[PDB]
Amino acid sequence: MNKLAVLYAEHIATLQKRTREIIERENLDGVVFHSGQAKRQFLDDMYYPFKVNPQFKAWLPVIDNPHCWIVANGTDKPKLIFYRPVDFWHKVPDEPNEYWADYFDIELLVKPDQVEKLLPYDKARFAYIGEYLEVAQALGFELMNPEPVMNFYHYHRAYKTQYELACMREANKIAVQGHKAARDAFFQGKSEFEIQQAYLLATQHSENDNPYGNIVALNENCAILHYTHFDRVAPATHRSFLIDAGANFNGYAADITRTYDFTGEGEFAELVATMKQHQIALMNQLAPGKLYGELHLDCHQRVAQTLSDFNIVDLSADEIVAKGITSTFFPHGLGHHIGLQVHDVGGFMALRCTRKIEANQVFTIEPGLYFIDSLLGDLAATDNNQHINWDKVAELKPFGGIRIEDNIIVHEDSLENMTRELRLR
Amino acid sequence: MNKLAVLYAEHIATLQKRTREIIERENLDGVVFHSGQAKRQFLDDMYYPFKVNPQFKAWLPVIDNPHCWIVANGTDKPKLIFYRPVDFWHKVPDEPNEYWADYFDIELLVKPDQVEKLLPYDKARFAYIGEYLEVAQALGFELMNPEPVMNFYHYHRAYKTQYELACMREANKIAVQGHKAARDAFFQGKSEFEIQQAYLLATQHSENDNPYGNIVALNENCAILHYTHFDRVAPATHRSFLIDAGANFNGYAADITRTYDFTGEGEFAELVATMKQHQIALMNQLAPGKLYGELHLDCHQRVAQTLSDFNIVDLSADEIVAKGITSTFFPHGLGHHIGLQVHDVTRKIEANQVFTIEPGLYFIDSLLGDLAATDNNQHINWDKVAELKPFGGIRIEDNIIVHEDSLENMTRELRLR
Amino acid sequence: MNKLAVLYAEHIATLQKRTREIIERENLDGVVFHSGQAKRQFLDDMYYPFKVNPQFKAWLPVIDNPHCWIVANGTDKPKLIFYRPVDFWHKVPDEPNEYWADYFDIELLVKPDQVEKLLPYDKARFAYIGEYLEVAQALGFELMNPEPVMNFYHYHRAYKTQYELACMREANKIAVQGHKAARDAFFQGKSEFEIQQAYLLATQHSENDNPYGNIVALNENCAILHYTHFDRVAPATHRSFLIDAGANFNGYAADITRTYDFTGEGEFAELVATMKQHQIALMNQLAPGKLYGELHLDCHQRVAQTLSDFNIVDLSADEIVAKGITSTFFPHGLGHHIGLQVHDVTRKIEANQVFTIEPGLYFIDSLLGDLAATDNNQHINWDKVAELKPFGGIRIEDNIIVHEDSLENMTRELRLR
Ligand SMILES: CC(C)NP(=O)(O)NC(C)C
Ligand SMILES: CC(C)NP(=O)(O)NC(C)C
Ligand SMILES: CC(C)NP(=O)(O)NC(C)C
Ligand SMILES: [Mn+2]
Ligand SMILES: [Mn+2]
Numbered sequence A: 001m002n003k004l005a006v007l008y009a010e011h012i013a014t015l016q017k018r019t020r021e022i023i024e025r026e027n028l029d030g031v032v033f034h035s036g037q038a039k040r041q042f043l044d045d046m047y048y049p050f051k052v053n054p055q056f057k058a059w060l061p062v063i064d065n066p067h068c069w070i071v072a073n074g075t076d077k078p079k080l081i082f083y084r085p086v087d088f089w090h091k092v093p094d095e096p097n098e099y100w101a102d103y104f105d106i107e108l109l110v111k112p113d114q115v116e117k118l119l120p121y122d123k124a125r126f127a128y129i130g131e132y133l134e135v136a137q138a139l140g141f142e143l144m145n146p147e148p149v150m151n152f153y154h155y156h157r158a159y160k161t162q163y164e165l166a167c168m169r170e171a172n173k174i175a176v177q178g179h180k181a182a183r184d185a186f187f188q189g190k191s192e193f194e195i196q197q198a199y200l201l202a203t204q205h206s207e208n209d210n211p212y213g214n215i216v217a218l219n220e221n222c223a224i225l226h227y228t229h230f231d232r233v234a235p236a237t238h239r240s241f242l243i244d245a246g247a248n249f250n251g252y253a254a255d256i257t258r259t260y261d262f263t264g265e266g267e268f269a270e271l272v273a274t275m276k277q278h279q280i281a282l283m284n285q286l287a288p289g290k291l292y293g294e295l296h297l298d299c300h301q302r303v304a305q306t307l308s309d310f311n312i313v314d315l316s317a318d319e320i321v322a323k324g325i326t327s328t329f330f331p332h333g334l335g336h337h338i339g340l341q342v343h344d345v346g347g348f349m350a351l352r353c354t355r356k357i358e359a360n361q362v363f364t365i366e367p368g369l370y371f372i373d374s375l376l377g378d379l380a381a382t383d384n385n386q387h388i389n390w391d392k393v394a395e396l397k398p399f400g401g402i403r404i405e406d407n408i409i410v411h412e413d414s415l416e417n418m419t420r421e422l423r424l425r
Numbered sequence B, C: 001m002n003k004l005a006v007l008y009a010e011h012i013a014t015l016q017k018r019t020r021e022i023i024e025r026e027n028l029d030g031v032v033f034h035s036g037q038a039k040r041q042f043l044d045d046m047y048y049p050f051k052v053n054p055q056f057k058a059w060l061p062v063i064d065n066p067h068c069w070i071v072a073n074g075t076d077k078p079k080l081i082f083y084r085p086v087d088f089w090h091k092v093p094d095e096p097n098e099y100w101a102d103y104f105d106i107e108l109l110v111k112p113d114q115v116e117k118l119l120p121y122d123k124a125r126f127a128y129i130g131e132y133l134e135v136a137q138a139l140g141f142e143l144m145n146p147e148p149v150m151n152f153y154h155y156h157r158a159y160k161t162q163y164e165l166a167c168m169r170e171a172n173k174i175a176v177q178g179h180k181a182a183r184d185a186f187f188q189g190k191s192e193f194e195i196q197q198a199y200l201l202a203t204q205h206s207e208n209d210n211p212y213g214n215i216v217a218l219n220e221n222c223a224i225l226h227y228t229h230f231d232r233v234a235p236a237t238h239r240s241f242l243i244d245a246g247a248n249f250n251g252y253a254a255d256i257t258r259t260y261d262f263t264g265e266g267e268f269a270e271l272v273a274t275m276k277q278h279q280i281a282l283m284n285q286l287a288p289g290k291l292y293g294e295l296h297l298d299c300h301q302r303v304a305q306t307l308s309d310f311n312i313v314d315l316s317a318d319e320i321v322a323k324g325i326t327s328t329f330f331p332h333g334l335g336h337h338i339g340l341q342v343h344d345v346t347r348k349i350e351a352n353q354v355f356t357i358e359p360g361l362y363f364i365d366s367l368l369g370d371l372a373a374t375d376n377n378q379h380i381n382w383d384k385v386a387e388l389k390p391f392g393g394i395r396i397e398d399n400i401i402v403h404e405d406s407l408e409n410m411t412r413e414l415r416l417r
């Protein structure tokens, strides 16, 4: 059989159920999900890569097809207007024939402007869920992405079905295959660009195939949080390596990060090691009922406990915390839900210190320690400048920073660290 | 077909399951729910209006019928003993033939005394849930409203089934109709008595149909938190109007309050608009996991803020809260659960619970006098107090359903400004 | 009709469900539970008393039978290999014809070795849960107590099913009978040994039947937390008495502790009454969501308050908790989970869980001596310890079921004070 296919059946049933609750709560005849269209480059004839509407790939693993429409009410079989053009120019895939095809009443669409006769006769009562408000309005839809319907699905999107969890496991598997190849490459001393190419080859992913734009940084670039470029020339000296990169599976994202030392023995190599442990401990705290805010205060606690131990700051943890200086070394959140979207949706009425970690939710735990001169500077401009070992900073500054991020499934009974279980030390 | 009908199924199921968990926990063979009886007036042949046992209508929408009995163990089908006299004096109704009828095994009772026959022969382990202790004892029951069972059912009453929420929506619907007609009557310059008549006609409710005695206050009566009368004569001039009033549907209540300024302008009209903002802002703080306490505090802050911004108290918000002055302008709670009973049976907000959000701001003598004797007296703009005094007070209250994902303000979704 | 009979259905259903949910997650075709075997005494022909596999009885109440196996997946009716040998030397029980029988496909085993014939043909994706590894491997199994499967059931074992709650109620009932008989034996000045025999006779339990090894202590013995021996000879003088004993029902256990003062007046008697308070006060801070750690810290608080009130210590409750001396008069936990195992398999108290709130205050030389070698020696009222030491200590343990709507102290609801 197909473990995935057996899971899918329940996935559909879950979405169907949520579709019924919501159109009732808002008195709708049904919800229409538009996959989107391709965007044309200004004054050109080229297009940007296509990126499906999350709300559409939520139902099925069709992420590379524009002009597809889902119309459902939760009780009847959902309709799938599937775009399958015909023209010798582009290769034509066979009609939908995989396990999910059976769960929809599929109607083939050959021309994007022919969709109206395939849609409901009276559209006034169906909610349009998509980006092209103009096109919907032309077809007769009047309810444009109703906040109530959007927040509803978004709220439940935080609770991953079994098919979703399996999908995400697959995405993690592919992503580590590449996080290791990218590792080897760093140690072989290749450039950021070469390593990035290594990661793509190992994940069999094209650049536009991955969930977000990879961060492949070396030495001081590791401090650029949102580093996007890829130097083509390998640094003179290879010191530090930080790579934030994921992979995709049926529309679900993986979001892993790893920092490395080139040798594996100096101060920095030591710093990373602390972080790893800190990271794993923060990972170990996830449990239904916990408030993210607690793991937050604890991450910052551990940061300060690290800044004090490596004499980066000549104070104690409680004071680095208290005086409020841990944020200039760890300037971002500890984690975020993740699924169909890297920084996934959810939460009571459209990550907070108040939100509660619940079962079947997926998270990233990504604590970090960075030496970001811009942020480092503003610290020297306050009467805290005194309490810091600047000589120590410049001693590490050339390594940029550290980040370790895993993707963890939270079960009612336990934690499943997809990343580490796949053995990515 | 019938939306209420479908949801009812799950209602019964829920109640049946709630019942099982409890007769097992307390080792009972079943629970008996007595609709109640009609109270005769002293020395007279007249009676009081009938008021069904809450514990009884929790199961079905039969609220105008005395001498009715429900006996269930949560496992077997629930047993309904249905009072139904026969005679020419009173109009007799067609047998129970509505959606709910099928979920019970109905036994027609033609006379109150002719009931013991239909009840369980060995009422040893059956608990009697009702007001009529003696009547029960003489029948054979011994367990009288056994506390653990009452607190049990009452705990779970805070968690409404879908059926219940649908009933509540319908009651808010009716109640808003009335609230609109009431507002109209006010502006037409009618009297409290007349505004009240208007309300009853729009809601198609008789006075004894209200889930509670309406409050129809005009001008300074708006400061009487429990104003009971309806003046037959109208005010010389019309300034303010406060109406707290709801309605009923299948035993569920709506509890809605709205305040209005007659001219729509002046300081009071703006104070009501300020209040309306706070009310909505409070309603918007509701969310599963949260402590009502939190909302209570913020409400007092909102009052503190308003008191300062309008120059009622010459102190900053924090100054007004710190000195506990707010409580003399807003003496009651912020809200309560609502359901089968208007005031339904630290505490954390949770899904499927229905609350009222009723911030208020009033100018009450008793309390302003008590304030004048606390020395805070030399901190409040007694001129501004006297200026607004003639308006009485303000209160705005909605009924909100709290879903796991969002809020459903029944009252405002009905477009009752 | 019957009692447990009904609740059992839902018991099976639930374990079935939990099994489905786990075989799939671990990619297993099924799980096999081994009741166990009777261990033979070295070089002899006598055996140890049989002690069933918790994981095995977790399904049905067959705790005295070795060579029994359960094979399930969560979807198919569960498979039961019931060991039932035949021969004139032993009495032969009828075939399993009790309510729990029908929930299984029952295959009788007459000799152990003959088990391979009834077990899964391909044992590749079957997890063996038992302690007899070599026998498993020799049978074909390879998956021996896979950790993620063990941690699964155990996690859920913390949530009892109605049936399981019934069974535990019965256990508490029986235990309380024995706890009252034991109580009287104490006042009648009997020896530890006699008191125990009194407990056993009242609870109708043979020594090996009780959940754990009963602790029956008198005087200074009370300070020995794990007192295992029973004095055959009564104490010269009768001061104090601590008894930690429980019972067994269908595999479920009771674990109650009561401390007494012979005279019923005097420092100790007082100190005991107070402890009783703190125990009831704590038993009341039990509620879904409560953080054990908060209870545990509040207990140590009351302990420090008693150490200060009875002036055992010369410091304020807080300074006592401050210098952490409290850990020398209360060296053990505040409670634990209980169910199929006495010590059942930062944490929050959920509903449908069962806890043993068991606070205590003891005069252990072993620790007082350690404490006297610290600057705290400076604060301790030694002249007071010598006045209590002769009584050993105290411990009041109850078994409470946490429901979502309320709390249920089984022990106390049974009348044991
Ligand atoms: C770019 C983004 C996907 N990486 P991240 O959100 O996991 N961590 C940030 C803070 C760099
Ligand atoms: C009379 C009662 C139903 N109104 P209320 O409880 O909503 N507000 C009170 C505080 C005046
Ligand atoms: C022997 C054991 C079952 N008793 P307990 O664990 O409840 N208390 C300890 C401190 C003796
Ligand atoms: Mn079709
Ligand atoms: Mn950016």
Ligand SMILES: [Mn+2]
Binding pocket: A244, A245, A255, A256, A257, A366, A405
């Ligand atoms: Mn990342």
Ligand SMILES: [Mn+2]
Binding pocket: A255, A336, A364, A366, A405
């Ligand atoms: Mn991330």
Ligand SMILES: [Mn+2]
Binding pocket: B025, B026, B148, C408, C413
């Ligand atoms: Mn009870």
Ligand SMILES: [Mn+2]
Binding pocket: B226
């Ligand atoms: Mn009153």
Ligand SMILES: [Mn+2]
Binding pocket: B244, B245, B255, B256, B257, B397
């Ligand atoms: Mn009201």
Ligand SMILES: [Mn+2]
Binding pocket: B255, B335, B336, B356, B358, B397
């Ligand atoms: Mn109210």
Ligand SMILES: [Mn+2]
Binding pocket: C226
């Ligand atoms: Mn021991």
Ligand SMILES: [Mn+2]
Binding pocket: C244, C245, C255, C256, C257, C397
């Ligand atoms: Mn014990």
Ligand SMILES: [Mn+2]
Binding pocket: C255, C336, C356, C358, C397
């Ligand atoms: Mn114990």
